[PDB]
Ligand binder design. Structure first.
Ligand code: YAM
Length: 245
């Protein structure tokens, strides 16, 4: 990938390491809309996540097109934008079926990541991209109100703590993008969790799906479902909602 093959058109916004731009990438003459991540120990880490994304090849994880070793990461651009904002715009037209579909698609992403003990740390609707109305994609690697107790208290992140956060993300999806614990300030989140209080069931969320969510919010990380079991469960929730629809 040569920099002459990538034209920058506009700022997309501000990423962890530097600016993100949108532009177009052109070897067969096809014009491809891309997001270009840039970088102002953090350079090497910037590169590490890029190499990881280059090796990931999954339908529900954002696609890396190439890397320009001013180091640019050329990612596929999804113009629909973040899932959170997509949900709030279309909350009156979106059906429960589709919201379970989105959760299942991210869970398939996570299940793949789990199989290589790869902890993601930012499974949140703001970090999920809408590729099409029936396809969401998990964004780049990494939020007190999304984190498990053992991450808030001990800065420990495992696949089990990703499962907790995944259930927080499902809560966000079934809530059409509300922020978890928006009635709480950060300081009293862990206190609330220590007591055994959780997020309440969203109005549109089927009870079977909320039971699954509560299992992911087990204070004990060992008791939480694995992502492989969740995919089967949600596949099961999805087929049922589809039959009702
Ligand atoms: C805007 N930013 C993001 N916010 C949330 C998730 C992802 C990004 C940027 N990443 C991507 N962003 C997009 N598309 C996209 C997004 C957000 C909007 C738009 C398009 C239009 C818009 O108005 N907001 N497509 C692919 C990627 C990716 F991941 F593959 F590199 S930022 C804070 O500047 O980093």
């Amino acid at each position: 990938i040569a920099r002459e093959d990538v034209v920058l058109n506009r700022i997309l916004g501000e990423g962890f390491f530097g600016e993100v731009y949108e532009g177009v990438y052109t070897h067969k003459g096809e014009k491809i809309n891309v997001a270009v991540k840039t970088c102002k120990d953090n350079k090497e880490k910037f590169m590490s996540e890029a190499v990881i994304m280059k090796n990931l090849d999954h339908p529900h994880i954002v696609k890396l097109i190439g890397i320009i070793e001013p180091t640019w990461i050329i990612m596929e651009l999804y113009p629909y934008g973040e899932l959170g904002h997509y949900l709030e715009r279309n909350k009156n037209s979106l059906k429960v079926l589709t919201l379970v579909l989105y959760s299942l698609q991210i869970c398939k992403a996570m299940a793949y990541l789990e199989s290589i003990n790869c902890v993601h740390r930012d499974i949140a609707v703001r970090n999920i991209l809408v590729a099409s109305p029936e396809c969401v994609k998990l964004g780049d690697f990494g939020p007190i109100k999304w984190m498990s107790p053992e991450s808030i208290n001990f800065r420990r992140f495992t696949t089990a703590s990703d499962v907790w956060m995944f259930a927080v993300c499902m809560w966000e999806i079934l809530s059409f993008g509300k922020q978890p614990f928006f009635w709480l300030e950060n300081k009293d989140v862990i206190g609330v969790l220590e007591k055994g209080d959780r997020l309440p069931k969203p109005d549109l969320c089927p009870p079977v799906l909320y039971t699954l969510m509560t299992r992911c919010w087990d204070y004990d990380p060992s008791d939480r479902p694995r992502f492989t079991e969740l995919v089967c469960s949600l596949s099961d929730v999805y087929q049922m909602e589809k039959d009702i629809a």
